[PDB]
Amino acid sequence: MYHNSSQKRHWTFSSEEQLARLRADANRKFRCKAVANGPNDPVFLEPHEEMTLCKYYEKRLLEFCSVFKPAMPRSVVGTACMYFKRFYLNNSVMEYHPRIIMLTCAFLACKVDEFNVSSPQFVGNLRESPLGQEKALEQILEYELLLIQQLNFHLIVHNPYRPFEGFLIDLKTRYPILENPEILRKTADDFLNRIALTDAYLLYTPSQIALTAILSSASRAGITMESYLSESLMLKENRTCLSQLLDIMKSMRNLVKKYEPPRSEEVAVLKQKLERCHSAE
């Protein structure tokens, strides 16, 4: 259950500013360690560059998960993306390469969740030569313990998909004025992916994310379902909580709004810069 989960206690932060503080601290500490072991070197990377690179490689992780040869359940994909976000929230894209950590997060999400994939099959799901597959596999096993340690051994991740299904069940039963919430299901799947892309998972409970997805589908469907929260959620007698739920919904829809995909030239230059950083350690 989320309400006492380790994710809620530790891996859920107050505001986006805390995320930025932690990422900037990790990047700056890595820069200090690199300089002190050997400050403005044109090869070092700024936090926004790290953010764009992490966005691009999270898109890569989504692609790789969706084109997994055995059907990867959405729980494993969400768990892997959350592991990626958590790892790079407290670590830098320069110290550990995001492709290897992407694959390691996918592997540890396959293994922590009860998805059963044999490691040779997992690497055979990559686009490389068999010797390259073996190198990638040995890198993944080398980095798995590091990934687990940097997650502070909090391996359980609560996705918004189960609360999304629960909310649809509630809408089906207790909310009769709304009918056929399957269209809401499609548009909420779309919004839920688009919100997985941003940093909302570290700032909002999965239940809030699922409720926001379904109500955003209602809003974009021309369906006003504000009555659902007011009555049949007991919030009409709790005004502060209802106001806070509407505030959270608005803030996180706007958080979706102020997210732009990583560019093409910018990601290319950051990629080549990242390779130069990995070569000249």
Partner: protein, 65 residues
Amino acid sequence: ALYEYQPLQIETYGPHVPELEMLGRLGYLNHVRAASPQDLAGGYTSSLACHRALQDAFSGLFWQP
């Protein structure tokens, strides 16, 4: 030194989830797939699924750090 039963009452920030037994004739089970005889032969009842769905739909709503 007698023992008296205490409900565990672990805090769940969110609306009160309907109780497992008081959940079949509230209409909830009409919208979760039926427990197939193989499923129902074991402890599974297709109401555990609905109850967990409802319990994680309200896990944390009225919570923000």
